[PDB]
Design an enzyme around this catalytic site. Structure first.
Site, short mmCIF file in Angstrom:
data_model
loop_
_atom_site.label_atom_id
_atom_site.label_comp_id
_atom_site.label_asym_id
_atom_site.label_seq_id
_atom_site.Cartn_x
_atom_site.Cartn_y
_atom_site.Cartn_z
CB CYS A 110 -1.06 0.01 1.10
SG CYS A 110 -0.51 -0.24 2.72
CB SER A 111 0.74 4.20 0.69
OG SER A 111 -0.42 4.16 1.51
CB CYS A 112 2.70 1.58 5.51
SG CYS A 112 1.16 0.77 5.17
CO LIG Z 1 1.10 1.14 3.04
#
Ligand SMILES: [Co+2]
Ligand SMILES: [Cl-]
Ligand SMILES: [Cl-]
Ligand SMILES: [Co+2]
Lengths: 202, 227, 227, 202
Positions: A110-112
């Site tokens: 995702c993008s954490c």
């Molecule tokens: Co993420």
């Protein structure tokens, strides 16, 4: 739309926009949200947070050996003491770049990213190219950022599959003799704290 | 779920679009700002989602063609919509109708309301965060330095076990402590915390490649077994 | 290549769109018919592609967002364009300009030409086909019934080894004979034929699932190793 | 188009159409193709081939035990003798459905299908849902076609990763006593030769 092939047809971005407004309108009408609650969030992420916080931590590590030691021994306690804590920054770890070890952080799923310390992630950090490739060909990805590491340098990629976050502590470059902590902080780039760049001599 | 989101190790997505930091604009459309406000505002109150687990599965469930084209905050809109309907906060029919209203009349007025108590509540959430760390009565199954087997499991619901790491040997780097278990929590099936570990995998093992590369991944205890 | 094309084992693509056979129209647009004519016409003459290997890699190289949205004959157009430019049959600039002409003026006249010799040549190709079976001097490394290891290899160029089958144990079901090797042939690096095998994999091994399911996959010799 | 995000924006189907015409025009102008060569191909695949060929092979297998035996022993020789051979049909194998074994054919990587014997593949056969899912949850996929097999029936999925092609030989249904070979052939569905359906009693 041929009903055999609805999956060929993406929602236009006008759909997402309309959907956002519809959600906003319904939630405010129902008493779940308010105009000022929404604005408060936007202010926080667009303006209050940013990479300058991480930059200050890096500069302090460079200028204060005892601080750097404490940071590397127990980053979560140290960062919380400084106030760099919050949503998506509850557990922040720090990994040091060294002459033969280079660190790169990614969230493949995702993008954490540690908002309280670094602000919002780079555009590219959230996109498939970086996410897909950096775990498998990090040298090729780094070269697209202008970082061409020798074969002899080991690369460690830190995939953020849990809520544990990582910041990269980049090395202090040449040419910085006599600079103050505040002046060194201005050298520390967002990209250097993700691992996709070294810091250039001034 | 073995979805489009799980991109680690994929080929074909092309070059990374490098941009200088100062030029890397956060938001180019107001709806993107709004998406952030919706997510944080709802989450702060436990509406649709209490932690990020439920948030993530709503994104993972997107149609692949949407996932790849919506843009990043499009994911956030999709998952807020998904979760608010799924939990009964919003009705799907009402949401679709209202969507249609804003599609046909984009300048439709947004209702205004001030709620300073809600502002304080949201602010508290932004600053306090929400740690998934728990304590459990069991001891860790694995030890630092142990060579483990990352299992070949294929949950159809949410998981944090990237496909590229499945069916591989790795080495325990750290025992973090017990964390809320995503594969259950995302589906509202309880925190059921398990020990979380950091695990180092070598390039040779992941890819059969010969460079000095490694990947450190965080894996829940149930993703692994002893050798 | 670990691309968007390699979908086996993915979740999230949704229900299969069932349609009764008699209602399952082959073509709904003339350009789709044309795509078929382009592919077979070129291939029959060895233009851009001689076998299907080069054809497949051109599709695999599509942008994922295009692969998922172009529709099926869109893949065929993409790979003909790719291969004709790649081999120097067509110039990219000229192709792009001509594309622009038909974009802005879709009713632009198509040049007519009759070539009955070419028709006979194409017809011969449709009926004769093109077998990839070869003979080699080596003997097969593997035997029917042998338990083998399907290797964890990650070629960045073309392969016929689906990701879902990598790093798995399977059982040889048949030794077909030596076939032209796709991982080389797709890149114009020689036929370099290798023994081709059919290999049975169990659901438990592929997925960790408990039903009476198995997958029979055809694997080239170099994809596998003894146990 | 924000140059950070060109990958969000698919080519419209009008692009592929234009591209097709451009290719057609350039190749004919250069003497590589002709109008009649293109038409000859379209005629072959849209009209000359179809599932009726496989249907005839199935009906013959049902009515002639010696033929069925030869077909199962050496399908490639037998099918070639019948003239069901050509592009994408050079090596065709046949697998028999039995009471406790059900066969399903797929090309997970693309669309591979024995054109000379079965004609063009189903719309859905080429699309990601079927391709992704049938190797992992064939029972769920089959149920979407109306085929709900008992747990006790073994499923064999045949993924066409090479140029070897497979046709499924479905079982003759009840209620067909006294039917001629030609009448049985009319019962054999395209779907039954892929493995996604059994044949219904008349
Ligand atoms: Co993420
Ligand atoms: Cl550095
Ligand atoms: Cl049957
Ligand atoms: Co295929």
């Amino acid at each position: 739309i041929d009903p055999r092939f609805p999956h060929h047809h993406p929602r236009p971005q006008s759909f997402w926009e309309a959907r956002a407004k519809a959600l906003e309108s319904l939630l405010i009408e129902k008493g779940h949200l308010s105009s000022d609650a929404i604005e408060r969030v936007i202010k926080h992420y667009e303006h209050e947070l940013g990479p300058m916080n991480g930059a200050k931590v890096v500069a302090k590590a460079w200028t204060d050996p005892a601080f750097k030691q404490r940071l590397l021994e127990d980053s979560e306690t140290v960062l919380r003491e400084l106030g760099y804590y919050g949503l998506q920054g509850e557990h922040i770890r720090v990994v040091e770049n060294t002459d033969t070890v280079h660190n790169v952080v990614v969230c493949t799923l995702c993008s954490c990213y540690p908002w309280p310390l670094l602000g919002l992630p780079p555009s590219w950090y959230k996109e498939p190219a970086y996410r897909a490739r950096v775990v498998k060909e990090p040298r090729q990805v780094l070269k697209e950022f202008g970082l061409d590491l020798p074969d002899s340098v080991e690369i460690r990629v830190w995939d953020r599959s849990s809520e544990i976050r990582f910041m990269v502590l980049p090395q202090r470059p040449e040419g910085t003799e006599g600079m103050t902590e505040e002046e060194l902080a201005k050298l520390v780039t967002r990209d250097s704290m993700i691992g996709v760049a070294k810091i250039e001599p001034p | 779920m073995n979805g489009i989101h799980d991109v680690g190790g994929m080929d074909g997505f092309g070059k990374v679009m490098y941009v200088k930091e100062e030029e890397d604009i956060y938001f180019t459309h107001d709806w993107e700002r709004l998406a952030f406000g919706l997510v944080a505002g709802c989450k702060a109150q436990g509406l649709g989602m209490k932690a990020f687990d439920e948030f993530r599965i709503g994104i993972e469930l997107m149609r692949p063609v949407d996932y790849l084209t919506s843009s990043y905050y499009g994911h956030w809109i999709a998952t807020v919509a998904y979760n608010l309907v799924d939990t009964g906060v919003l009705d799907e029919k009402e949401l679709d109708e209202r969507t249609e209203v804003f599609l046909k009349k984009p300048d439709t007025k947004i209702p205004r309301r001030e709620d300073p108590a809600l502002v304080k509540l949201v602010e508290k959430a932004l600053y306090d965060g929400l740690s998934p760390l728990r304590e459990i009565s069991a001891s860790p199954r694995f030890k630092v330095g142990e060579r483990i087997k990352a299992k070949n499991i294929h949950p159809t619901g949410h998981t944090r076990f990237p496909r590229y790491a499945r069916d591989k040997y790795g080495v325990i780097d750290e025992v973090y402590g017990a964390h809320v278990f995503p594969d259950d929590a995302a589906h509202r099936k309880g925190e059921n915390p398990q020990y979380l570990y950091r695990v180092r995998f070598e390039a040779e093992e992941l890819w059969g490649y010969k460079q000095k590369d490694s990947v450190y991944i965080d894996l829940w205890e149930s993703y692994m077994e002893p050798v």
